Amino acid sequence: EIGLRVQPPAEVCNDPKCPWHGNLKIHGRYVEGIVVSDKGKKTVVVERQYYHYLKKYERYELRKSKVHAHNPECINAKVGDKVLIAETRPISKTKSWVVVAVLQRAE
Amino acid sequence: TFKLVISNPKNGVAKQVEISGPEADKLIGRRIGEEIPASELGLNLSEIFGEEIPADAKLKITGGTDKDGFPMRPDVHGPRRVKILLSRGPGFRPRERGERRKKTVHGNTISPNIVQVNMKIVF
Amino acid sequence: ARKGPKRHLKRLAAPTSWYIHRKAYKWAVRPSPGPHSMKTSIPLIYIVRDYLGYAKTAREARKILNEGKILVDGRVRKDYKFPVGIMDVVSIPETGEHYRVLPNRIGKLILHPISEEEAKLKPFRINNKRMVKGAKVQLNLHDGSNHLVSLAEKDAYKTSYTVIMQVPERQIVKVLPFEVGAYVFVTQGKNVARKGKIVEVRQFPMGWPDVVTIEDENGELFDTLKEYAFVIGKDKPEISL
Amino acid sequence: MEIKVTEIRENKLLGRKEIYFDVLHEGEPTPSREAVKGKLVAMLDLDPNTTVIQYIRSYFGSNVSKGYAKAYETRERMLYIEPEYILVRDGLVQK
RNA sequence: CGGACGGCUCAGUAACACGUCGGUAACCUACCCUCGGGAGGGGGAUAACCCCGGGAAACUGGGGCUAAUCCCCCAUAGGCCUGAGGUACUGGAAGGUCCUCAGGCCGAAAGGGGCAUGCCCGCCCGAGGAUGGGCCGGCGGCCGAUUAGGUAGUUGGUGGGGUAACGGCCCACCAAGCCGAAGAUCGGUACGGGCCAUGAGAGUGGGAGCCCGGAGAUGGACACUGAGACACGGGUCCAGGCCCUAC
Ligand SMILES: [Zn+2]
């Protein structure tokens, strides 16, 4: 039972790069986002929005940050889906996060 | 003109002598690790060296030094000079652990640029 | 660019937990590694020279230490860089003096005088438990020390309990458990040196540490970290504070 | 010149008595180490040897100066603990 | 044993360099602390020293002799890899630790010194801590469009090598991805911060001297020894300059 409380997938993975049933360990922070690209093999890009305060002008500006995450087969997430990700060790040059759960699919 | 340093181990003593002429010309071309009968050079051990030394004695080459003051090294062939990176001698006293230097030495083979020679007796 | 470890400490960069005049000189004593951390310990020379006053210069202090006159948990210590920390007992028999090292409410280290009967005991918090070769159990304690116990008596020891020991010989007596009426002393944080009784313990997910809720004498409730709560009794302090 | 002891402490680890005293000198100059030690021992029943004065210090306008001395039990410990410069400064020792 | 700290400077760098919060269950660590255990049996050489020296110096040859906490071997403990089982521990989460079996590779130690009739200082293995570092991530911090497309190990995958360790860090094979008008790329300028100057404040400007961090040692590259360096009073080469010389 990996530390995070969510309903694990309904299928049994055999891939060592899967937290559920495998050897990839998650440790640290957890955030939500929305998938923007699903073209790489086993790779998803995730976006989240946030407001940044500007002091002199007393106002806010919106910003977007992107993250590259590992996407296992038992948890297969495509464009448009809302998803939760967690930090782990380096997997490639640009990927150090892994998908843990899909919260709401898209159409 | 070649100077010789003749060493006797049985007592641990050495004598220096001068040489010139064909007796010197004979040494040229001879490498370190070779045995020579003394008389060929035109000398005799009895008189000048010490008490008494059995005949058929044989001098062995072990090293020497040249005009400018650089030593011979057995594992460098030829009569010419070289500069090489050394970690131990002969030709180098390290003075510190893992230390290396680029020293110039003389080759394994004798040539008129040489001055002194070191000979050991084999009984 | 540094090519190896440090051997110097500037006095402005010294820990806050020390009583030290930071602008009087340039250098401070750099502590050697040992029983406690840099953030919970002070070298002996500062105790012998500044906190107590038996010496005015470091040469005099070093002569005192080399003559063999200061004990820490009942053991002779001659290194002036040796670190003394929380719950350690400092003893001087030529004077009959016995002190316990504790923190203030500001977070600084002080010496509390105690008696010779209590200068024989020292508590230790258990920080971890291991199996070692021979199917034996190792307890890793709060000052970095280690103690061995058997299988049969393994369930009597846990990772936030406290063990009281005779110090030079290290014999156990009076295990104290972490419970809901246990008397606690706080060692770090904003509420350092407050005491009271455990009221509640909460756990969190994904690596975040556990929190403890405590009730003080006046009835005021407060919170701290379980790893900062040091058990010293069941309902009354086994030692003086 | 008169003297008035103000604090005595005993150091058993180093083996000495630390003596803080006041000196009173009105209309007079700052007294000398000789006289100060003389009166100190004459009063407190000490051996002149085994005793060192660290300092006599005068302040801006006071006529009341401060002084600090150290009384040892044996001269061997005295010389093994104290640095040579104060011994030369008092006169117990020649260079 | 130490000399890898201290000290000096800001040329380079718009970068995970710096700041802050976190992580390493993916790593190393001599000196120090605690606990648990060990010190058996055999060998060798060589500096000093003596007899001869060479060379202007810098430096350096031969022969004889001899010690160790110097060096080497044997064994035993111990370490690492893999396969099959069991289920004692920790933790939020384990083949990470523990137990049993099997097939193998590597492989310790100075019972040395002082005192005295047991003590002090040291040597090796294991488990942990401390200290000091390596690596990763989220967030934040200059100007230019009279710089608009950039990228080809480039983005990712499978399987391996190498590393103290994760990783296109490197390799073979398969694909076509990665960044960008919310300013990519290119260029200009510059060590970063804590702080400082000024002003009623909002703000504008700076960041040499003290502390923390980073980088450098004529320019540019490459290695040996060591716990730790590609080394600030050490080494090798090229360029550039300077000096001694019996050339
Ligand atoms: Zn699965």
DSSP C15-76: -TTS---TTS-SEEPPPPS-SS-GGGEEEHHHIIIIIS-S-SSHHHHHHHHHTT--EETTEE
In DSSP notation, C131-188 reads EETTTEEEEEETTS-EEEE-STT-TT--TT-EEEEETTTTEEEEEE---SS-EEEE-S
Contact predicate C48/C61, CB 8 Å:
yes
Residue C54: CB atoms within 10 Å: 20
Give the residue among B77, B83, B68, B75 at the shortest CA–CA distance from B110: B77
Q: How many CB pairs under 8 A join A and C?
A: 11
Query: Cα angle at D35 between D32 and D38, to 5 degrees?
Result: 145
Contact predicate D52/D58, CB 8 Å:
no
Chain C CB within 8 Å of residue D61 CB: no
- Which residues from chain D sit within 8 angstroms of residue C60, using beta carbons? 14, 81
Chain C CB within 8 Å of residue A93 CB: no
Using CA coordinates, name the residue in chain D closest to C48: D13
Give the residue among B30, B54, B52 at the shortest CA–CA distance from B41: B30
Give the residue among C176, B86, B95, B4 at the shortest CA–CA distance from C185: C176
In DSSP notation, B105-119 reads EE-SB--TTEEEEEE
Residue partners of D59: CB distance under 8 A and separation at least 6: D65, D66
**Single-letter amino acid code for the residue at C152:** A
Cα C58–chain centre separation: 25
Rounded Cα–Cα distance for residues C228 and C185 (Å): 8
Give the residue among C5, C13, C60 at the shortest CA–CA distance from C33: C5
Are 3 or more Cβ–Cβ pairs between A and C shorter than 8 Å? Answer: yes
Contact predicate A30/C206, CB 8 Å:
yes
Chain A CB within 8 Å of residue C206 CB: yes
| Per-residue DSSP letter, B95 | -
Give the residue among A47, A51, A45 at the shortest CA–CA distance from A63: A51
Chain C CB within 8 Å of residue D10 CB: no
Give the residue among B23, B30, B14, B17 at the shortest CA–CA distance from B121: B14
Are 3 or more Cβ–Cβ pairs between D and C shorter than 8 Å? Answer: yes
| CA-to-CA dists, residue D45 to D16, D21, D37, D40, D41, angstroms | 15, 15, 11, 8, 5
Contact predicate C112/C98, CB 8 Å:
no
Residue partners of B93: CB distance under 8 A and separation at least 6: none
Report the length, in residues, of chain A.
107
Query: What is the Cα gyration radius of chain B?
Result: 16
D12 CA – E203 C1', rounded, Å: 66
Chain A CB within 8 Å of residue C134 CB: no
Report the length, in residues, of chain B.
123
Residues in a beta bridge with A53: A60
A51 CA – E139 C1', rounded, Å: 12
Rounded Cα–Cα distance for residues B61 and B121 (Å): 9
What experiment produced this structure?
A: cryo-EM
Chain D nearest-CA distance from C48, in A, is 11
Q: Please report, in angstroms and rounded to a whole number, the separation of the first and last CA atoms in chain D.
A: 31
Q: What's chain D look like in SS3?
A: CEEEEEEEEEECCCCEEEEEEEEECCCCCCCCHHHHHHHHHHHHCCCCCCEEEEEEECCCCCCEEEEEEEEECCHHHHHHHCCHHHHHHHCCCCC
**In terms of C-beta distances under 8 Å and separation of at least 24 residues, what long-range contacts does C50-53 make, across chains too?**
C50/C19, C50/C20, C51/C19, C51/C111, C52/C111
Give the residue among C193, C177, C191 at the shortest CA–CA distance from C235: C177
A93 CA – E171 C1', rounded, Å: 17
What's the A75 CA to ligand 1 centre distance in angstroms? 8
Residue B32: CB atoms within 10 Å: 19
**In terms of C-beta distances under 8 Å and separation of at least 24 residues, what long-range contacts does D35-41 make, across chains too?**
D35/D1, D36/D1, D36/D3, D36/D67, D37/D69, D37/D90, D39/D1, D39/D3, D40/D3, D40/D69
Contact predicate B60/B74, CB 8 Å:
no
Using CA coordinates, name the residue in chain A closest to C208: A28
- Which residues from chain C sit within 8 angstroms of residue A28, using beta carbons? 206-207
β-strands D2-11, D16-24: how paired? antiparallel
Rounded Cα–Cα distance for residues C16 and C108 (Å): 7
What's the C27 CA to ligand 1 centre distance in angstroms? 58
Tokens coding C77: 């210590």
Rounded Cα–Cα distance for residues C177 and C236 (Å): 13
Rounded Cα–Cα distance for residues C162 and C177 (Å): 6
| CA-to-CA dists, residue C141 to A8, C39, C147, angstroms | 38, 17, 8
Give all chains having 3 or more CB-to-CB distances under 8 Å with chain C: A, D
Residue B16: CB atoms within 10 Å: 9
**Single-letter amino acid code for the residue at C193:** A
A3 CA – E154 C1', rounded, Å: 37
Using CA coordinates, name the residue in chain C closest to A3: C206
Residue B113: CB atoms within 10 Å: 13
Q: Tell the residue number behind the tokens 């049994």, with chain if given.
A: A12
Give the residue among B81, B85, B76 at the shortest CA–CA distance from B31: B76
CB contact burial C72-111 (16+ within 10 A = b; e otherwise): bbeeebeebebbbbbbbbbbbeeeeebbbbbbeeebbbeb
A44 CA – E172 C1', rounded, Å: 26
Rounded Cα–Cα distance for residues B37 and B60 (Å): 9
A71 CA – E237 C1', rounded, Å: 52
Burial of B52 (0-12, 13-18, 19+ CB in 10 A): exposed
Query: Cα angle at C165 between C163 and C168, to 5 degrees?
Result: 145
| Per-residue DSSP letter, A23 | S
Residues in a beta bridge with C121: C166
Rounded Cα–Cα distance for residues A52 and A57 (Å): 12
> Cβ of A30 and C206 within 8 Å?
yes
Q: Where do the H-state alpha helices sit in chain B?
A: 22-25, 45-48
Contact predicate D20/D4, CB 8 Å:
no
Contact predicate C239/C232, CB 8 Å:
yes
Tokens coding B7: 């060493």
Chain A CB within 8 Å of residue C208 CB: no
Contact predicate C76/C68, CB 8 Å:
yes
> Cβ of A4 and C207 within 8 Å?
no
Q: Which nucleotides on strand E sit less than 7 A from a protein beta carbon?
A: 3-7, 22-26, 30-36, 50-65, 88-95, 97-99, 126-133, 135-141, 155-158, 166-169, 176-180, 182, 202-204, 210-212, 214-216, 224-232, 234-237
Residue with smallest Cα–C1' gap to E51: B13
> Cβ of C94 and D13 within 8 Å?
yes
| CA-to-CA dists, residue D1 to C103, D35, D37, D40, angstroms | 48, 9, 12, 12
Rounded Cα–Cα distance for residues A11 and A105 (Å): 18
β-strands A97-104, A59-70: how paired? parallel
**Single-letter amino acid code for the residue at B16:** Q
Q: Tell the residue number behind the tokens 């940044």, with chain if given.
A: A52
**Measured CA to C1', what is the nucleotide nearest B68?**
E55
Q: What is the resolution of this structure in A?
A: 2.5
